[PDB]
Design a protein around this ligand. Structure first.
Ligand SMILES: *C(=O)/C=C/N[C@@H](C(=O)O)[C@](C)(Cn1ccnn1)[SH](=O)=O
Length: 263
């Protein structure tokens, strides 16, 4: 809606940074609203949904199992590993690692899962093979969050990320059971959501994944709608702002409030 576009541009002014935005119809794929749809932004932790999509694709092909238990050591642990740091002696299942990566944004969990598929270049090959010739992962946690200006590593475009998310949640790309598992991981309760979940009223469905990086990088991908069902994809990215985390949260929340108000 035009008034949401006015708020996206106001967010640019307040952050002193570029904001990328797109709304897709979940059923038809049609673009309802866009701003900088084909400019590149750092994915940050929003890639973890694409990762678990690649993992579920291999489960569907008989090349992986949700129940397989993986053992790791102290030397695998990177910064922010609230689940993986507790399971040094007993390990974790693929199921538990995808839950920890998407729901608890566990960085070690994302690295262990990247190891299962053969690293960042194999996530890029997965995406290339289902028709996303733009989105690319090049590095591991934590250095995929560096967000150097004009560096195309670990980047997507809003339009590419939105089309890919739609194909994972509703195509024939994953099986019915794997689609449900991916959206289930994205829907699960988190301790705090100061982004789209703060603007979302009771009765609305939201399945999302948020992102933060260096140089004021911030983002979110979401399937959401009224009446307890998703009916739209929303992708929001920003990079370059010197504004506090609180100020970046508030601007994305206000884009959400406008999206909901003018649904
Ligand atoms: C992606 O790069 C980060 C996702 N999760 C973050 C966030 O969105 O801010 C949270 C805060 C988890 N976290 C704390 C420290 N590092 N990650 S979660 O609450 O969404």
């Amino acid at each position: 809606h035009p008034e949401t576009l006015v708020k996206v541009k106001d967010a640019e002014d307040q952050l002193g940074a570029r904001v990328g935005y797109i709304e897709l119809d979940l059923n038809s794929g049609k673009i309802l609203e866009s701003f900088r749809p084909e400019e590149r932004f750092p994915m940050m932790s929003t890639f973890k949904v694409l990762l678990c999509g690649a993992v579920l694709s291999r489960i569907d092909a008989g090349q992986e199992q949700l129940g397989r238990r993986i053992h790791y050591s102290q030397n695998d642990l990177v910064e922010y590993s609230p689940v993986t740091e507790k399971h040094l002696t007993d390990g974790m299942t693929v199921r538990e690692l995808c839950s920890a990566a998407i729901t608890m944004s566990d960085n070690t969990a994302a690295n262990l899962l990247l190891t299962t598929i053969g690293g960042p270049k194999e996530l890029t090959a997965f995406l290339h093979n289902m028709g996303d010739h733009v989105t690319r992962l090049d590095r591991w946690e934590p250095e995929l969050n560096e967000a150097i200006p004009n560096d195309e590593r670990d980047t997507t475009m809003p339009a590419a990320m939105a089309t890919t998310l739609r194909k994972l949640l509703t195509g024939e790309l994953l099986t019915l059971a794997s689609r449900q598992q991916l959206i289930d991981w994205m829907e699960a309760d988190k301790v705090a959501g100061p982004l789209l979940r703060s603007a979302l009223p009771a009765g609305w469905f939201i399945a999302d994944k948020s992102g933060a990086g260096e140089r004021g990088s911030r983002g979110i991908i979401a399937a959401l709608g009224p009446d307890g069902k998703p009916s739209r994809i929303v992708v929001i990215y920003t990079t370059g702002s010197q504004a506090t985390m609180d100020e970046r949260n508030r601007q994305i929340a206000e884009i959400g409030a406008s999206l909901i108000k003018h649904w």
